[PDB]
Amino acid sequence: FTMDHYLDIRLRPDPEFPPAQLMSVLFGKLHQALVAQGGDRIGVSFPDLDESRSRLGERLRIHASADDLRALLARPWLEGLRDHLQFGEPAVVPHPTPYRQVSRVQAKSNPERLRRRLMRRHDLSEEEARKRIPDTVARALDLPFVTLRSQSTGQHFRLFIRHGPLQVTAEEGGFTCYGLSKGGFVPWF
RNA sequence: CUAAGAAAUUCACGGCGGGCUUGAUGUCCGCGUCUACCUGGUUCACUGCCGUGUAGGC
């Protein structure tokens, strides 16, 4: 009733398995696919496949109702792989209630950028640009890693995804997707 | 209840100096070292509508 279709993809094993890079190419091809389609009406999740909360799953599930799904990256609208997945076909969802959330976050682990932005913003001096308020004392960080090289005009990002409150508490009908490529309230298993 | 039981050695010095080891020599001949490999599980990156304001953006 929220977005009632799912694709239980299973990335097969392969003697080349950089998971950051496999999910990088997959999420990047998905980015290309949905910016070619166009629309803030799509869902993406990652079911309970992260055993620890360090790794990330070897699976995926896309949540678009009928038309965006069948027209977007699917059996039509080429993936360009069709061999490394051998995936299936979607169908209607059951009735769970884990409160349905996923999230994107990014942190700061390179104060060179911040000091350079200070130097650029109002022509800061080197001594204060060195000790006004960097975070040289401690380097923040985030656990779940995916690489996702730049869509264009850039270089290797390192994107972080935190599963939101997945509590068996309630449910609500909210927006379709936040960010750009990531649904909002999404059914979870 | 110890062949027990005890015990101040203490003082100084000129080893001196001289010298031909000499000549000579043929190491001399060989040699199959092979064979196959994923550096990949990682580059926390230039910005900026930013909030320098530790959450905030592709």
Side-chain angles (χ1 to χ4, degrees), chain A residues 2-15 17-50 53-76 78-134 138 140-165 170 173-174 179 183-189:
Chain A
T2 61
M3 292 299 291
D4 61 356
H5 287 86
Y6 65 97
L7 284 78
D8 292 331
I9 294 168
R10 292 181 180 89
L11 279 70
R12 277 90 171 92
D14 193 359
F17 185 79
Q21 292 180 357
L22 272 77
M23 289 291 170
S24 178
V25 297
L26 194 283
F27 182 76
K29 289 177 182 289
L30 184 62
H31 177 74
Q32 296 291 323
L34 62 87
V35 300
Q37 291 295 111
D40 60 355
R41 187 270 304 277
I42 187 165
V44 174
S45 180
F46 292 97
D48 193 358
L49 277 293
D50 51 354
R53 294 289 183 274
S54 177
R55 280 84 65 196
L56 188 143
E58 295 182 355
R59 289 180 60 192
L60 184 65
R61 62 179 66 257
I62 298 89
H63 294 280
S65 295
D67 291 332
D68 186 74
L69 191 147
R70 289 193 295 274
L72 185 137
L73 183 142
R75 182 63 59 81
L78 73 166
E79 289 175 354
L81 294 169
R82 272 72 172 273
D83 293 331
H84 197 193
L85 302 176
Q86 296 293 111
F87 66 92
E89 188 67 26
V92 174
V93 298
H95 296 89
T97 303
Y99 185 69
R100 289 82 174 274
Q101 184 63 39
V102 68
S103 66
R104 181 179 180 274
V105 298
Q106 63 180 2
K108 298 184 284 291
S109 181
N110 192 357
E112 281 78 358
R113 294 195 293 275
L114 278 298
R115 292 177 290 172
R116 188 172 64 245
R117 185 175 173 82
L118 292 169
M119 292 179 184
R120 186 267 305 280
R121 186 171 173 82
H122 60 276
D123 191 359
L124 182 63
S125 298
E126 180 61 26
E127 68 279 16
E128 291 177 352
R130 184 77 277 285
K131 69 187 179 292
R132 181 176 289 274
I133 182 161
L141 56 85
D142 288 326
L143 275 295
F145 62 94
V146 67
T147 300
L148 181 57
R149 187 262 187 190
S150 177
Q151 62 274 22
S152 63
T153 306
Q155 65 273 19
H156 292 277
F157 290 167
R158 180 69 61 80
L159 185 61
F160 296 104
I161 294 163
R162 297 288 189 182
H163 295 92
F185 287 162
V186 68
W188 183 67
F189 296 105

